[model samples]
Target: GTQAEKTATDLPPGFSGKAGSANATPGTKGLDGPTPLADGSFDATIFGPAKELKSADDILNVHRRNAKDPFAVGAVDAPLVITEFSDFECPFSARWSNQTEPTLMEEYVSKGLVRIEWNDLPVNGEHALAAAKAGRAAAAQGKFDEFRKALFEASRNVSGHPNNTLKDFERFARNAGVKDMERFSREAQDSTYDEVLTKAADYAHGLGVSGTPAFVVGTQYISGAQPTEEFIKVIESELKKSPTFS
Candidate 1:
């Protein structure tokens, strides 16, 4: 699991600032809040406990390390990549998955304009971890997207809180068309993916993502279930940068 760290700040009540020093109480100095920029987008530097993001390259480097097939969409060589750090049980993440992701895929991924990758950050406890690994198991059978959508759709009815069990996962896997029921059943219980999922969570934490549905689009950090327009604008901005592979 990603260990939480404290920050420093000093500001007035109702106002926000950095986390203050050790011994600094809530009323003393440091206040907690998102760092907003003039352009209405939150600054990525505000979330970092290890190091503040200074440039797009810094952000890209940290996230790109986790991009891999079976957990990603679009081509690896695509011009731009949108890395999503999500918790399956997170309603906000489900909101984005169900409402926003399709349009994104149609507009960006299908057009070869962008690549989207998933890094499971299970913050909701055991059930969340089970859901994540199940997704990976499905991915092994080339059914990642299908299983992901099915799970998200099912999650909606449960208010995004899935009661993940072997039977539940098997049912979802069948719904996703995982032909090999035996394989899917076995993989769902496999503990191998736990390390992979945990490492992703650790990486997300290092980048200051403390919640689900966080995104790394090109060099910008988008938090929460933002509107589609916000995503489009960022994608266009990144497209203009003429992203290329070395």
Candidate 2:
């Protein structure tokens, strides 16, 4: 997988997915995360020939492996990497997070067996896009985990799309304890993350992945709100093929 538009990073005074790691010193390079990553090390053919994933290791290479990434969770060197391409408002995505993911969190992520990475996909439209950007701001404040928990909880019993507007986003920000409301408001409205999200989604589209709750688990691409048992089966099989197991 050629890492398109991933080279222009490194805390410079320019567009980067790093969200808002800086205060006001620089007018650019905020702190954040990208599903495709901003570095080229993982994009190259470091594993096998890399012609569309010749081996399991090739899929492992697809894992961004950035431990410091704000939007990712689990050990950087975790054996299994699950890249989640999803939006907040999608019922299926919420299903995975609200129900199935908790199983994985306890059985895999908490045990250091797997790592999960978040990539914003806004197929649900305006509110979804707006909410995702709000997540970026939450990540900037080191509360993405909190922000996500809050949103997922809020969306747990929802029947309609009520998670829209700046007011909704601010409520989530407060519930997640985002200390810098001023900065959160400013960054959430900014378009800094637009290119990063679009580029990542473009890559997903290239792989024919255009659905909510889509995933790249090990070497296999998965979509839909698959049951936890199914996910466990895939993860166990992947563990045997993973480098850590050997």
Candidate 3:
């Protein structure tokens, strides 16, 4: 499952191609669908009231919405922002974490060229709740990155293995170097993080994300287990509009 550090050579699933009008809202009636967007594939070129290109002001607003950056690894003013709404335990999300993430980060994010925002849209009973709670615990301990990496890596072992349970996930996190186990265990069972995780899920729903690893670059929607080059191409194409962003 952890094949050769997956690159974005594959394009995001569900999406047909770049949104017809870059500014088109996500839906069927928003913009003209691209050729690559096959029939039945998701081509969110529909929604209404989309601007030709999100105005600088709008872009600025998106920048301000950076949530997990207290560590400062993620810059608010990144030229291209990729917001991923995902379920932590979701196998597909794990694929991006293990295979796609490293390449994307080393090539794009590490340079501060793009800011990857994570929104937990956990679904699957206790798995979602536990994952979200564990995430918050990591945040509390300033180990969100560690937790994220661990969560993704765990997926490699259980992508379709079945018989995986929430307990199995927590154990994975514990073994993946999650420090402060006492705190992690206590917080994981607290249920306080329930709303936090659910809110993000609701936000994903509002954003029309029906699956794991739903990505958004500005108003553009990129979804699925796409190859690395595809995302790199997408990022590069997006950066062209503002080549000088610093």
List the candidate 1 regions with Cα displacement exceeding 4 Å: 1-56, 62-68, 157-160, 243-246
- Look at candidate 2 and give me any clashing residue pairs: 18-30, 18-31, 18-32, 19-30, 19-31, 19-32, 20-30, 20-31, 21-31
TM-score of each: 0.72, 0.74, 0.68
Highest lDDT among the candidates is held by which one? 2
Of 1 and 2, the candidate ahead on lDDT is: 2
lDDT of 3 by residue, 1-246 (tens): 765575346345345343222322222211121122333222111111122224445433323332323212344555566767667767778888788888877865655566666666666656665776667665555556667786667568884523344566567557657666776677777765666565656655654668877776654567887887677667666665554444
- lDDT per residue, candidate 1, 180-208, as tens digits? 78877787887757667766677677666
Candidate 1, number of clashes: 9
The candidate 2 region of ten consecutive residues with least summed lDDT is: 41-50
lDDT (CA) per prediction: 0.67, 0.68, 0.57
RMSD of each: 17.4, 16.3, 14.7
Q: Estimate the overall C-alpha local distance difference test score of candidate 2.
A: 0.68
